[PDB]
From a paper:
In archaea, the 20S is composed of homo-heptameric α- and β-rings, and PAN (Proteasomal Activator Nucleotidase), a homohexamer proteasomal ATPase, is the RP found in many species. Unfolded substrates enter the chamber through a narrow pore in the center of α-rings, where N-termini of α-subunits form a gate to impede unregulated access to the proteolytic chamber. We designed and assembled in vitro various asymmetric archaea 20S, in which one of the two α-rings contains a point mutation, K66A, which prevents RP binding to the α-ring. Our studies reveal that, upon binding of a RP with a conserved C-terminal HbYX motif to one α-ring, the gate of the opposite α-ring opens allosterically, resulting in similar proteolytic activities of 20S singly capped and doubly capped with PAN.
The first one is a wild-type homo-hexameric PAN ATPase, homologous to the Rpt ATPase subunits in the base of 19S in  eukaryotic 26S proteasomes. The C-terminus of PAN contains an HbYX (hydrophobic, tyrosine, and any amino acid) motif that is required for binding to the α-ring and opening its gate. We also determined structures of PAN-αWTββαK66A in the presence of ATP, without and with substrate GFP-ssrA, both to resolutions of 3.4 Å. Because of the symmetry mismatch between the heptameric α-ring and hexameric PAN ATPase, PAN does not engage with α-ring symmetrically, and not every binding pocket in the CP is occupied by a C-terminus of PAN. To obtain sufficient resolution to evaluate the gate conformation, we applied a C7 symmetry. Thus, the density of PAN in this reconstruction does not represent its correct structure. Even so, the conformation of the gate in the C7 symmetrized density map still represents the state of the gate. Whether without or with the substrate, the proximal gates are in an open conformation, consistent with the gate opening by the C-termini of PAN with its native C-terminal HbYX motif. Furthermore, the C7 symmetry averaged density map still shows rotation of α-subunits induced by binding of PAN’s C-termini. Thus, structures of PA26PANc-αWTββαK66A and PAN-αWTββαK66A both show that the gate of the distal α-ring is open even without direct association with an activator; this distal gate is opened allosterically by the engagement of an activator to the proximal α-ring.
Residue numbers in the entry:
A (entry chain C), C (entry chain B), D (entry chain A), E (entry chain G), F (entry chain F), H (entry chain E), ...: 7 to 233
B (entry chain Y), G (entry chain X): 1 to 203
Write the structure that this text describes.
């Protein structure tokens, strides 16, 4: 009888509406990424749909800068609006300070925006989680921003339906500072062990950055190697 | 232009000329500058034509709304106070107008209001381009023991002097005596022509 | 007890109100379209109504530009307001960039608009789905925008009451780069196999564009050929 | 339990509040009209009330322009406010384009206005349907605008309590391009067959326009002929 | 369960809240009036209260102009606010057109105002009916404006608790163009036959206008004649 | 089930919320007043409280002008805010017309204010009744303004818990134009016969005005005479 | 125009002339520049007529609202502070007025306020066109050990000197002595004419 | 079922929400004060908390001016916001009138502010009572302002959990014009007899003012004398 | 049935919604701090998470100035927004007065912000408690600001899930003016005795300030000493 409004706690003291937004994140496809020796990557599973899809507009990975990028899971509607706000806040940040000095407060702008909607009645929150990644003045960065607005900056995570199984794998297998290729293949094995039996891992989009370089997205045949 | 307003014993007499220019170039030989603003008071016009007519429309509206809310006529001090507050809420985009409102409520009054909203009580007043002439003749001939006919004769002599000695004024004079008994009565032009021909100011 | 407000999730984590808007789309007539060798077309079923109807204002296909066009299904009221916002956003896009450079962010503007109304209380969403189509700097484009605001660009789809049967046909019959005529007849067969038994396919509106050309609407007798 | 708010769909996916506004239209008296060889007419039933009624202000037919006119049915309150908005939108249309070029977007302005109130909470829709009619740059026009905002241009319809019986008659009797008189008498027979047994058709207001001419309203004795 | 909000119809399609405002009108005292040979009058019953009432501020008849006047029944609170809006709209009308040219759109302004509050949530309507009366460029006029906003313009009506009995009398006795006195006495008999048994008709306020003249209110001893 | 919102009538057509505000008036102490030969007075009962109370700020009678004054009963909070609005409206009235010409529209301003809050949801009305009194251009005045906004000017009334008993006394004893003293003693007897058995009438505040004079408040020993 | 305000032992005396011009052209030989602003203080006028009368209306309203809220009269420092804050909230669309407010609360005061709202305490002050004349004669003859009759005689001599040596001032003088005992009393014009004929300043 | 909104009366005619705010006042610690021969004091009980408290920021007594001061009880959050509004209101009063002339309308402003929130929906009232005290142009003043906004100026009171027992003591023991010390000791005995059995009165903050002087707060060892 | 809205009290007079926010604070990890001989410190427990976490953005202690600092517990989303408002209010304070003169009204600004959201409907409060600490013109300061907006300045406290056990320890062990090291070790023992059996205290962040110096954060190996 309390899971109806965003503004009411339970007698335990929970926000059931916020947690249901976190549940709506869980219905989206798994996407992971880690940082390594001089840089960070991202991996996103895509169950290949109608071949009629031009691949350009189903990329869960999106470039918010030449030096920051991220990936979503959940309500694709809210997801898209969020990646838009990430881009616009990156622009305002870059113009008031000459450059995107710290990725952390780009993620802060996005997080405070997602925070506020968990508070006021007449608004429902965003049912999306975002994993930011890039290079700043400090180096490799990798955040995750959930529906409530929590940011915790990792050197690896996932989001989505697999997230527990992937972070379970990485929590017992990952070792830092791998040279990029070895890191990618570890993350591929991580993504593999999150599926259900019988399911064959299709081709997932993966992209990376190294210190002093821009992004690049591995095209499907550079991806095809690690199958 | 010219106006005149004269308070006597139990009445108040106002009159204007009717010539509107609007250019140098006198353009309208029969305008309207004397307005009935309520059933016991009237308002004259001696300013810019558009601004003055908008003020006449607004004050007709406000006094009719007033009487219709309270079933009492407005005091003359109240109508001059209202007009002063209206003209002084906007004076840096002001109305270039010299208004004069007179009437009788329990005692006759005629009030003068400039473009900045300065209300002041006086027993005889005038505004417009041909104003100092009628102030001269009112100062020389006016007494407060006059009757209504003597008052309107003094008014016609005044405005006739202003017509003979001014360019901006002219045309046919219209006069309205407002008193407590008969209410607002505007004299017909035939009686005014009879008074002019009786006083011998015609040429 | 949760399908009453736009702002409340279920304990499964669903938005029943948004899904009911998607159900309200399902009550509208089937409309499909695909892209082919240099360009895209659209097909829209119309069960021919009162002959009193002047045909000019029952066209489910509508021209948002000389180079972008679309089709709706659902609440005809919301549908019309949506095609209006599509036109106005096309104009603002074309004036701030000199031309409609990418169809994708026209569809983005429309989708963000339809997105927002799935979020705030005191507003119900739009019960319409839209299939955009056209030629840009990249080439043939074909989106579909649903009530929640999902966009997925296809090279073929339908919307409406048939949509499952039509996409079922296209999912096993369609082959890309058909010369325009052959493509149209494939899409006609697709539209045919979505009706119920006994129903005879009437005359549907069909229109197309090719690379470097404007739209044209096949008039009823050019349509009459493929019956 | 769902027919309480304008913003909630049913699990079938219906808007019961909008449909109840359509029901409130049904309580108003029948009014019909058709276009013919060079022009359009309108017919509106009036059960003659208190002879105290000055006939000037019970005319269901109203002139929105010298070249557009319409008729309502339903909540007389909302009806009047609607015909006001029709007039004002005709004026804004005529001043931004020099003339009322198309009747269709006058009806669009009215329809989008009636549309919006079917969407937002804290507002109920208009319980009125409107039948516009006139001459534009194209020729004879005849729309119907319902509470939801649907417009369908006809060459004949009704609205009101009889609407089904009248459109049932016209659907099997009407033939286009009748010379004005014959058309009117057909529409009178249409209006006749919508009443209940025993009811005698009183004098209905009827008015027309022809291409290149203004409106005129047949006065009661020109009406009296066709009884 | 539906008569709680102004914005919800019933499954019959009624606005129970609006009708309850019409019921609140019914608790006010009867007031009638008719037009005749060159002019209109009004009659309003007053059960003479606390003699302490200075008669000035219990007049149900109120002058909105020297040439328009009206009378209310219902919530005296809303009634007073309405007669205020009638006066102010008469003033704005008179200044934008030089004179109150038509009484009809004064009554339109008042009616659209009373209309709007039957529509939006968070507002209840006015529980008052108003009977306007006067002389315009056309001649004698006599409207009645109810809570919903209906205007119908009579040559006679009542409002209030008696309204059915009075309009029942006038519907079978009234004959137009009576010389003023005879008209008044007919209306007095109309007001008489609306009371209950034993009740003696006290002194009612009555006032009239003729073509080319202003109003006057018959004082109590001119009223006292027709007892 | 309808006495919950200010905006809903009953099927009888009553505003139970407004009537409950009228009930909240009934919990306040009795206060009366009448006009007489050239002027008006007021009487207000006060059950003498804590002697710590400085008498300056428990006066139910309050001076809104040197020539208008009033008294309240009910919610002391709303009461005070009301007498404030009475003072401010008296000032605005006096400056836009040079003087407080009519007391009636001061009471109109106060009543329209108390009126509006009986109408809109999200607002509760004022639970206070006010009895204004004074001298204007017409002469002695004495209104009473209730929660709904009814004004009836009297030449005598009460408000408060006794009001029925006091107006019952005055309705069978009061005779107009008494010389001030005799009037006061009649009003004291009126106040006396409203208490319950055993209760001794303490010292009530009484104040008056005569034509051409200002107010004065009888101090406690001039009050003490009439015990 | 001219004003004068003189504080003595247990009273304060203010007076103005009555001639309003409003043009060059002296137009009203009997205006009103001395106003009762409250039962124990008054306000004089030496500026633009409309702005000054609007300020008089507002201060009458605000002080009456004040006394009606608190049942205490306003201090003279409080009324000058209020007037200064009002005039200085708008100084770039300012009121072209030179106000002077005096009165007694527990000790008599007379305060001066310019068009920008500069309040300053002084025992004798004056404003208007004919101001330096009355400052001259007040500086030459004024002592703080005067009575009320000596004070009002000094005031009449002052304003008579300003009338004899200035164009803008003129007309009949009106004077009001405000004291704690009798409250606000404005002297009738017959007593003022008697004082003029006793001092021998008539011609 | 009625104690849920601030805007609904009971059928008795009570405001249960307002009274519950008065109940929330009752959970705060007792604080009293009285005026005497030339001046007023205040006493506030403090059960001495965590010695870690720097005593500066737990003072229930607060200086709103050098010549006005007050004390609260209830929700310490609302209490603090209130004493802030008291200070700012004293400043605005002092600048528009040169000095804090009357304490009464400082208390009026605070009261009207606390009043308004007992009226409008979407707002809950302040759950605090305030006891103002000081010296003005009139002399010693001592108000109490409760949640509803009632002000009654006393020469002695309390607020808080003891308030009934303290005012019960003062109602039978207090005698005016005590020299300051004797007054304080009477008030200490008043505060003593409000505790429960076994509880030892700790050190309470006490402060005073005399005519022509500023405040001073008795420090803890001047307090320690009267133990 | 009352713990649903922020604006309703219980018949006991409690704000169950505010208390549930206080319960939501209780789910966060324990954080303590005290002041000593010339300065204050803070201690915050952190159960060490994913080694992927960059330690820079999980610091519960945050520097609001070079001379003020604080720590949170509860909703990490609201926590972050709060520490942002603390920084911004510190900046506005420092620019309008040249320096952060008093820490107390920085904490006032934060508490008034957290206060207001406990009052208005359509807003839920912040589920965070904050412990500010620093050096001002007066010296060492240490507040705690809870969800309702209570501030009490301590010289020692905790917040979070342990808070009762830690303040229970400090309430019987803490002695003031310890030299910094001894103080820290006492606070470490305080933090130790709040855990459950079997749990080993990991490495907690601890930081301090002394009079005339800025902050410093003990790095993990200076922390490692006191294990």
């Amino acid at each position: 009888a309390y899971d109806r409004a965003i503004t009411v706690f339970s007698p335990d003291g929970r926000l059931f509406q916020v947690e249901y937004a976190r549940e709506a994140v869980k219905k989206g496809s798994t996407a992971l990424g880690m940082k390594f020796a001089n840089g960070v990557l991202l991996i996103s599973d895509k169950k290949v749909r109608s071949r009629l899809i031009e691949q350009n507009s189903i990329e869960a990975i999106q470039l918010i800068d030449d030096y920051v990028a991220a990936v979503t899971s959940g309500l694709v509607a809210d997801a898209r609006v969020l990646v838009d706000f990430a881009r616009i806040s990156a622009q305002q940040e870059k113009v008031t300070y000459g450059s995107l000095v710290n990725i952390e407060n780009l993620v802060k702008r996005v997080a405070d925006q997602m925070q506020q909607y968990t508070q006021y009645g007449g608004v429902r929150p965003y049912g999306v989680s975002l994993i930011f990644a890039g290079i700043d003045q400090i180096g490799p960065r990798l955040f995750d921003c959930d529906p409530a607005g929590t940011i915790n900056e990792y050197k690896a995570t996932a989001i989505g339906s697999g997230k527990d199984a992937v972070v379970s794998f990485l929590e017992r297998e990952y070792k830092e500072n791998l040279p990029e290729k070895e890191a990618v293949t570890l993350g591929i094995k991580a993504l593999k062990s999150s599926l259900e039996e019988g399911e064959e891992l299709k081709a997932p989009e993966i992209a990376s950055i190294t210190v002093g370089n821009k992004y690049r997205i591995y095209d499907q045949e550079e991806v095809k190697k690690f199958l | 232009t010219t106006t005149v307003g004269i308070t006597l014993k139990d009445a108040v007499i106002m009159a204007t000329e009717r010539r509107v220019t609007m250019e140098n170039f006198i353009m309208h030989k029969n305008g309207k500058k004397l307005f009935q603003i309520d059933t016991y008071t009237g308002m004259t016009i001696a300013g810019l034509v558009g601004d003055a007519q908008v003020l006449v429309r607004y004050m007709k509206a406000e006094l009719e709304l007033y009487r219709l809310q309270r079933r009492v006529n407005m005091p003359i001090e109240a109508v001059a106070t209202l007009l002063s507050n209206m003209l002084n809420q906007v004076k840096y985009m002001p109305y270039m107008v010299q208004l004069l409102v007179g009437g009788i409520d329990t005692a006759p009054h005629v009030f003068s209001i400039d473009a900045a909203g300065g209300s002041v009580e006086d027993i005889y007043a005038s505004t417009g381009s041909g104003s100092p002439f009628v102030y001269g003749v009112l100062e020389s001939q006016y007494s407060e023991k006059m009757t209504v006919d003597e008052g309107v004769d003094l008014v016609i002599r005044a405005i006739s002097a202003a017509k003979q000695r001014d360019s901006a004024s002219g045309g046919m004079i219209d006069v309205a005596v407002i008193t407590r008994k008969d209410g607002y009565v505007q004299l017909p032009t035939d009686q005014i022509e009879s008074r002019i021909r009786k006083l011998g100011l015609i040429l």
